[PDB]
C-alpha cells in the first residue's frame, strides 16, 4: 500500500521533514492524498494531525521505521 | 454531467444516428460567443429516430469506435 514516510523539505544541512502518506512506489519527494504530519529534528515541534493518521493506519498503510518511532513517542496507537 | 441535445442529421445506418451538437463557446482572445458544431454517432436498438428529430446524448459503454452514446429522448419542458 501507501507507506507513511518522511520527505526532506529544506536547504542543505537542514533536515525539515514532512510526514506524507504517499504510495510506496513513488520517489521520496512526490505527491500525496493528504500530507499529514511534520517532523523537525533540529529542535522544533511536530504537528501530527491524529485523526488522519488514524484514518490511514485504520486503512492499513504501514509506516516506515522512524515514522513509526515518532508514532511511538505520542500515544497515537488505538485499535478501533 | 449534462446531456448533449441536438438534431439528427442522417440515419441511413442501422441502430446508428449522426447528431449535430451545437455548442456556444466564448472565443478566447476576442470575447464573443462563437458556435461550434460537432456531430456524433449515437446508438439506438429501437432505431426510432428519423431525419431531423432532436435527441439528447448520454455517455454509455462504447459500442464501436465512434458509437459511444445512446440517445433516448429529451424532457420537453418547452
Amino acid at each position: 500500500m501507501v507507506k507513511l514516510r518522511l520527505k526532506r523539505c529544506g536547504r542543505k544541512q537542514r533536515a525539515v521533514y514532512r510526514i506524507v502518506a504517499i504510495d510506496v512506489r513513488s520517489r521520496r519527494e512526490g505527491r500525496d492524498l493528504q500530507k499529514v504530519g511534520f517532523y523537525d529534528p533540529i529542535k522544533s515541534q511536530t504537528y501530527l494531525n491524529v485523526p488522519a493518521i488514524l484514518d490511514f493506519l485504520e486503512k492499513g498503510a504501514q509506516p516506515t521505521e522512524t515514522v513509526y518511532d515518532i508514532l511511538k513517542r505520542a500515544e497515537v496507537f488505538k485499535e478501533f | 454531467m449534462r446531456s448533449m441535445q441536438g438534431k439528427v442529421i442522417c440515419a441511413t445506418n442501422d441502430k446508428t444516428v449522426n447528431v449535430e451538437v451545437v455548442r456556444l463557446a466564448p472565443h478566447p482572445k476576442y470575447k464573443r460567443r462563437v458556435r461550434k458544431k460537432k456531430k456524433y454517432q449515437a446508438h439506438d436498438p429501437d432505431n426510432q429516430f428519423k431525419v431531423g428529430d432532436w435527441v439528447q446524448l448520454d455517455k454509455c459503454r462504447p459500442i464501436s469506435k465512434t458509437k459511444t452514446f445512446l440517445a433516448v429522448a429529451p424532457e420537453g419542458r418547452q
Binding site: - | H27, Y30, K31, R32, V34
Partner: protein, 123 residues
C-alpha cells in the same frame, strides 16, 4: 476590423524580431577561419580604408567580418572569433571580430577601454 468575424478569423501576426545576424545562429559568437583579409571603402560621405577579414565560420556560412582596433596580426588561414554588430559604413559587413581571443592578438598600446580590445593591464 470588426470584433465579429474579420478578426476571429485572424488579425494578422507580426513576423518576429528579425535576426540581426543570420550567422551566429545558435548563440552569440562563433569561431571563424580567415579566407581573405582585404580592405574596402565605405559609402560616399566617409573616407577610410577599413580592413575586413572575409571569414568562413563553423556554422556553415561564409561572411565578411570587420576587424576593430589599430594593429592586426590576421594573415591568411588564421582562426578568429566573430561576434555580431553592424558596421554601418560598409555594405555587407555585418559582423565584428573579437580581439584578444584565439589567434587574434590585442591591439597595440591601448590604455583606454581595454576590455573591448583584449589588452591586459600595464603597470
Amino acid at each position: 476590423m470588426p470584433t465579429i468575424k474579420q478578426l476571429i478569423r485572424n488579425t494578422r501576426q507580426p513576423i518576429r524580431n528579425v535576426t540581426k545576424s543570420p550567422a551566429l545562429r545558435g548563440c552569440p559568437q562563433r569561431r571563424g577561419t580567415c579566407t581573405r583579409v582585404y580592405t574596402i571603402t565605405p559609402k560616399k560621405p566617409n573616407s577610410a580604408l577599413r580592413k575586413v577579414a572575409r571569414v568562413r565560420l563553423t556554422s556553415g556560412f561564409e561572411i565578411t567580418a570587420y576587424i576593430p582596433g589599430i594593429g592586426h596580426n590576421l594573415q591568411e588561414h588564421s582562426v578568429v572569433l566573430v561576434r555580431g554588430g553592424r558596421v554601418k559604413d560598409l555594405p555587407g559587413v555585418r559582423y565584428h571580430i573579437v580581439r584578444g581571443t584565439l589567434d587574434a592578438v590585442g591591439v597595440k598600446d591601448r590604455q583606454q577601454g581595454r576590455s573591448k580590445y583584449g589588452v591586459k593591464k600595464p603597470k
